[PDB]
Amino acid sequence: LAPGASIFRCRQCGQTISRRDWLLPMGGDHEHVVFNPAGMIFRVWCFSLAQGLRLIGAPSGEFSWFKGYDWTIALCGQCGSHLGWHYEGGSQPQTFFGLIKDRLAEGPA
Numbered sequence: 001l002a003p004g005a006s007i008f009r010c011r012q013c014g015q016t017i018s019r020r021d022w023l024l025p026m027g028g029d030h031e032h033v034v035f036n037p038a039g040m041i042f043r044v045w046c047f048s049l050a051q052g053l054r055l056i057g058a059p060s061g062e063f064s065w066f067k068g069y070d071w072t073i074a075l076c077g078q079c080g081s082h083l084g085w086h087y088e089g090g091s092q093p094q095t096f097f098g099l100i101k102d103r104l105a106e107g108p109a
């Protein structure tokens, strides 16, 4: 009854992005802490599915945090906030989203 932790929205604008139900335990955990080559740390949650994003450019394998996957930058389709990455080109699953947990807001359906 009345769950308050069902939907993830863009923290900056409220755009609908994903659901707790769609969390994906990649390598046995949904949470992955990673750094980019600029040394920025991200707490990434893996989702099987997401919506309301805009995927920018073509995939790159360069410095992929997930073995066998190529990444594309995922912006909030509404406000342009960088919310994470779409991963593709791999196996089991072929694709998923790695979203930056602190750039989302969790709340009711």
Ligand SMILES: O=C1CC[C@@H](Oc2ccccc2)C(=O)N1
Pocket: 035, 036, 037, 062, 063, 064, 065, 066, 071, 085
């Ligand atoms: O899996 C990923 C996705 C983002 C990616 O960041 C950059 C990669 C190359 C150059 C600049 C940033 C990364 O390090 N790993």
Ligand SMILES: [Zn+2]
Pocket: 010, 011, 012, 013, 014, 015, 076, 077, 078, 079, 080, 081
């Ligand atoms: Zn947004």
